[PDB]
Symmetry: C2
């Protein structure tokens, strides 16, 4: 209602399976929602900040967030948003990366809150032990190959090529939604832009097994110059202070182009509409001062690394 | 060489992955071959007799046959030769049917022979315990969706529709070939006409995991009138004497149309070329005597039910 209207003002709504039904439920109950993160490295990066902070915004509005660590799916790999087949990482690798990712996730969510404290979960727990036969019958009977082939993630790749491995990824995410729906009362799944197909697949599966739940995607973060958000000359801006120091983290935001700063404040910060607007007028009137750029840099660095870390970044600058 | 030439004379060769390479190996070694049979009922029927007796012919020529009971795959189902999606049978059903099928299979093969005694095996043993993740990675990475979609069994059905369940069947048969290749030295897989794709899938998988093995399909049994072999007004001619009595079994063969009798003698019996030819001339010269028809009926009834059973059939007629 107002949460949903606010996200919209901010631009964090790409798509929604049924906006009025979701607004309605958000307005009448504490909604359990989840978001999945697959260990594809030993650290999350700024590419994950939008869904993460979005989770946070949902928690502040009274809902209960589940951060799902992709222990099982990180072992298959999501073709979604990938032009090319990826290499399979080893269980040992994935297993190790999961532990860390778990650690950075927990930074952004509230565990003390009574009524809506977060949960961090690993799909390895229910996928690890599932036998193929069970999977093929209990999940697979519900999907036709034709439904699956039309998916953006797959349509996107059949000429390009895609193994059966990645083609099936979608069934596993489908299955996560169902299990979470069942054991946690999960009613909403959120994800980036590219997760649309995978989310609606979970919806398909719930619908066909139960006959009530929603999906919401966050848009790909844009740059006015048409380049790839977070694509630096330095390489990736990580959330691990040992990969990307607080000083570098800080610099990255402080170098936001005047053209992007206002969209980034809305996306990445907890500043009000009136604070964001005020900054917009200050950017108009005094753009060499770089007020919007320091506020973003401070806000986001504090979020991710905390105040002391920010203090250093500042004094190092 | 001569075995292969004989099958050819008989018409039991539909296709072969590489005839000269297979002739060669058959001629230089005791070849371990296998054939799969999925419990789709509590009894085999005459639709299975051609691959079965063909197995037998391979054993008589000195090779070692493995009859594979489809315990695991009978739980998924093969779309091959099926215009429509099938219903999933329960584990309890399949499990019970497997035990019987095992029993009728053993009738046709030699277990006493030293050097080439048969084996009866159940793919449940290696598929039952396989985890989805392992399956997706170890088997699935080897296949592109595009390779799989072009398969006759699938091409055959995407408009018609096919679940992910049946679409994946082929990976499981693929996997059987590999395991058997590995643990039993299996070098040849045989099957009916419709198994071509599933067999070449096992070949794909061996090739891609090892970098040596063959496939041979038996043709669909024809009727000169263009109707469906074994399609009776009575319904299916079963190999279970309690479903189709020896008398009815016997009658069915004795009613072979003059047009089919000679192809059926070649397919279904252990009569020599010279015996079969002689019958061909007797059919020419005295077709009201029905000599080719009684010889077929006696031969096949004895094979399946034994002499006493035949004796009854005869005296009951």
């Amino acid at each position: 209602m107002d949460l949903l209207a606010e996200l919209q003002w901010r631009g964090l709504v790409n798509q929604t399976t049924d906006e009025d039904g979701l607004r309605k439920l958000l307005n009448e109950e504490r909604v359990t929602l989840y978001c999945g993160f697959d260990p594809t490295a030993d650290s999350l990066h700024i590419g994950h900040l939008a869904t993460i902070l979005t989770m946070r915004r949902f928690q502040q509005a009274g809902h209960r967030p589940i951060a799902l660590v992709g222990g099982a799916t990180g072992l298959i790999g999501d073709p979604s948003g990938k032009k090319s087949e990826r290499t399979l990482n080893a269980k040992e690798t994935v297993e190790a990366w999961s532990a860390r990712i778990k650690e950075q996730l927990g930074r952004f969510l509230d565990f003390e809150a009574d009524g809506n404290p977060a949960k961090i979960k690993n799909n390895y727990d229910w996928i690890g032990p599932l036998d193929v036969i069970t999977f093929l019958r209990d999940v697979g009977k519900h999907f036709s190959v034709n439904y699956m082939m039309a998916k953006e993630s797959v349509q996107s790749r059949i000429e390009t090529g895609i193994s059966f491995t990645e083609f099936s990824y979608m069934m596993l995410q489908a299955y996560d939604f169902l299990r979470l729906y069942e054991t946690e009362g999960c009613r909403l799944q959120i994800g980036g832009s590219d997760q649309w197909g995978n989310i609606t697949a979970g919806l398909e599966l719930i619908r066909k097994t139960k006959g009530r739940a929603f999906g919401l995607t966050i848009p790909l973060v844009t740059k006015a110059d048409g380049t790839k958000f977070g694509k630096t000359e330095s390489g990736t801006i990580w959330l691990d202070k040992e990969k990307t120091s607080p000083y570098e983290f800080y610099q990255f935001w402080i170098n936001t182009d005047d053209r992007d700063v206002i969209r980034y404040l809305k996306y990445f910060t907890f500043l009000s509409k009136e604070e964001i607007e005020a900054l917009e007028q200050e950017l108009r009137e005094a753009p060499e001062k770089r007020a919007a750029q320091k506020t973003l840099a401070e806000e986001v660095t504090k979020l991710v690394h905390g105040e002391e870390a920010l203090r250093q970044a500042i004094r190092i600058s």
